[PDB]
Amino acid sequence: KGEELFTGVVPILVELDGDVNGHKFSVSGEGEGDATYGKLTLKFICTTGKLPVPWPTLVTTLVQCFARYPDHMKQHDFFKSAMPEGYVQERTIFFKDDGNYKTRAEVKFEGDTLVNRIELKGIDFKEDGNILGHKLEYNYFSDNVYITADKQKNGIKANFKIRHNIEDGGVQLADHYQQNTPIGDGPVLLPDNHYLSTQSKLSKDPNEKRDHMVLLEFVTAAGI
């Protein structure tokens, strides 16, 4: 029944309030998702002026209910099974040799629109690190979200790493720890171990003068 909400193109709204080492900011996003093709097209705007962290570090926080689950893996799709009431997605993101993000989001339908409401808290960041010093490249990254069942919370856990390219040629590692719990008390699909292969391509609207990010993302379930 949750899965039936995702058979076509769904409009998406994202709203994030963030505080990183006392720098407060807000991000608003709009776009659409097509889970048939695991395809997300979004545009994000920093509504408070200039973003105090690199756009790439926010991509993972800024809707895995749009993953393409192959037919033979459809019994493992927790994300869609929690809809429309939705789920809470929580993360800790450990930036190697730097600070950490803690995120809490509620992902749910408001009418026909899939809404992701986020609060992000960043602490222990270095003033001259890769994040607050804006030393990360703005291009493309890809990795696997390793998902396991969490039966006690009727939800899932996930772990993955993002290797953010640094401008000097190095790598800024971000270790992601994730938990998802349903908002409703209906039955949800608790999956076998598997992963989401995710590719994120970042670009700029040549006509947009506000601090912004255009995102083309593909998310595909695999490993069964």
Alpha-carbon distance of 4 to 12, in angstroms, equals: 16
Q: Are 91 and 114 in contact (CB under 8 A)?
A: no
- Experimental technique: X-ray
| Alpha carbon distances (Å) from 95 to 1, 102, 126, 132 | 38, 11, 11, 12
Alpha-carbon distance of 148 to 196, in angstroms, equals: 11
Q: Which amino acid is at 42?
A: L
CA count, 13 A, side-chain hemisphere, 147: 26
State the residue for tokens 């003068």. Answer: 209
Tell me how many degrees the CA angle 173-177-183 measures, rounded to the nearest 5: 145
H/E segment holding residue 169: none
Among candidate residues 102, 81, 98, 99, the one with its CA nearest the CA of residue 90: 102
| Alpha carbon distances (Å) from 39 to 36, 55, 124, 144, 149 | 8, 20, 34, 16, 24
Alpha-carbon distance of 188 to 71, in angstroms, equals: 17
For 170, counting Cβ atoms within 10 Å of its Cβ (0-12 exposed, 13-18 middle, 19+ buried), the class is: exposed
Q: Are 111 and 158 in contact (CB under 8 A)?
A: no
Q: Are 91 and 176 in contact (CB under 8 A)?
A: yes
User: Would you list the DSSP string of 68-85?
Assistant: B--GGGGGG-HHHHTTTT
Domains in the chain, please, with CATH? 2-222 (2.40.155.10)
| Structure tokens that stand for 59 in this block | 């991509």
For 120, counting Cβ atoms within 10 Å of its Cβ (0-12 exposed, 13-18 middle, 19+ buried), the class is: buried
| Structure tokens that stand for 112 in this block | 């026909």
Task: Report strand pairing: 39-46 vs 100-110.
Answer: unpaired
Q: Are 171 and 143 in contact (CB under 8 A)?
A: no
Q: Are 120 and 19 in contact (CB under 8 A)?
A: yes
Among candidate residues 108, 113, 105, 192, the one with its CA nearest the CA of residue 156: 192
Rg over alpha carbons for the chain, rounded to the nearest Å, is 17
| Alpha carbon distances (Å) from 221 to 51, 131, 191 | 32, 30, 11
Alpha-carbon distance of 112 to 32, in angstroms, equals: 11
Q: Are 78 and 107 in contact (CB under 8 A)?
A: no
| Structure tokens that stand for 3 in this block | 């899965």
Residue 158: phi, psi to the nearest 5?
Answer: -145, 150
Q: Are 180 and 203 in contact (CB under 8 A)?
A: no
Q: Which residues contact 3 (CB under 8 A, 6 or more apart)?
A: 74, 77, 80, 81
Tell me, what DSSP letter sits at residue 189? -
Residue 101: how many CB atoms within 10 A of its CB?
24
Q: Are 87 and 181 in contact (CB under 8 A)?
A: yes
Q: Length of the chain, please?
A: 224
| Structure tokens that stand for 39 in this block | 């395809």
Alpha-carbon distance of 114 to 220, in angstroms, equals: 19
Beta bridge partners of 215: 42, 202
User: Would you list the DSSP string of 82-143?
Assistant: TTTT-EEEEEEEEETTS-EEEEEEEEEEETTEEEEEEEEEEES--TTSTTTTT-B--SEEEE
